[PDB]
Design a protein around this ligand. Structure first.
Ligand SMILES: O=C(O)c1ccc(-c2c3cc(F)c(=O)cc-3oc3cc(O)c(F)cc23)c(C(=O)O)c1
Length: 235
């Protein structure tokens, strides 16, 4: 199997620089797209920066634009994130993910979902709406609703992630309604206008987690995550 190993995380002063790293093993990183998503302590997911597969086109998030840089190193089978002029809000665990080539899908929409995440690395410095929380009992049925706008969800492929406290996020649904190998079919995704929906029939005790949705936003030119839903199963 494949994995991303991250290192570089450290306690630093404000204004300091710091270089994070996301190394690939089991596969060759140069032939693949990737992203950097961070998660402040007690916050939700937030896109930061990314790399296009066949070229080397970077895109950055408005917050960290001009401070952060993202190069690759085909020789060390990895990709670095150069963070400069750090600020206290940058405080968070930074994840890195590969976006595989989507067999389905189409021109300009071939790298939509993040299917292999890293384990994360802490950097300490001295939008789409979902409900805050839903609840149910085992055997029942929840529906997590993700609503946005034309710019993003109406036009673009949407994807859902799952996340137990402390662990890295996991890909549940991509391209609106598909699911990767080894995901129970009791997970179902759909879309209707400018809002998508995650569906869990036959709820179980392990399903208890945080659920995010995500989609590219054409007008902002960023990748967007939802605020997140805390699913609670009555246990
Ligand atoms: O301007 C471009 O060529 C471009 C623009 C945006 C993306 C991009 C997309 C595009 C989509 F259509 C999606 O459904 C999802 C995305 O997700 C992305 C995530 C990354 O952060 C990144 F740097 C770029 C993209 C992208 C890519 O590498 O796939 C390339």
């Amino acid at each position: 199997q494949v994995q991303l190993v991250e290192s570089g995380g450290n306690l630093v002063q404000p204004g300091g620089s710091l270089r994070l790293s996301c190394a690939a093993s089991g596969f060759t990183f140069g032939s693949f797209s990737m992203s950097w998503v961070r998660q402040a302590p007690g916050g939700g997911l937030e896109w930061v920066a990314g790399l296009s597969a066949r070229s080397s086109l970077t895109h950055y998030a408005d917050s960290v634009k001009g401070r952060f840089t993202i190069s690759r190193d085909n020789a060390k089978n990895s990709v670095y994130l150069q963070m400069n002029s750090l600020r206290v809000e940058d405080t968070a665990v930074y994840y890195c993910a590969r976006r595989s080539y989507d067999s389905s899908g189409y021109a300009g929409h071939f790298y939509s979902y993040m299917d292999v995440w890293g384990q994360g690395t802490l950097v300490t410095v001295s939008v789409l709406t979902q409900p805050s929380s839903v609840s149910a009992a085992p055997g029942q049925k929840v529906t997590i609703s993700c609503s946005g706008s034309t710019s993003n969800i109406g036009n673009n492929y949407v994807s859902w992630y799952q996340q137990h406290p402390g662990k890295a996020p996991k890909l549940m649904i991509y391209d609106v309604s598909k699911r990767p190998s080894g995901v129970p079919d009791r997970f179902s995704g759909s879309k209707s206008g400018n809002s998508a929906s995650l569906d869990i029939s036959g709820l179980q005790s392990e399903d208890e987690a945080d659920y995010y949705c995500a989609a590219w936003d054409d007008s902002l030119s960023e990748f967007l995550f939802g605020t997140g839903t805390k699913l609670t199963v009555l246990g």
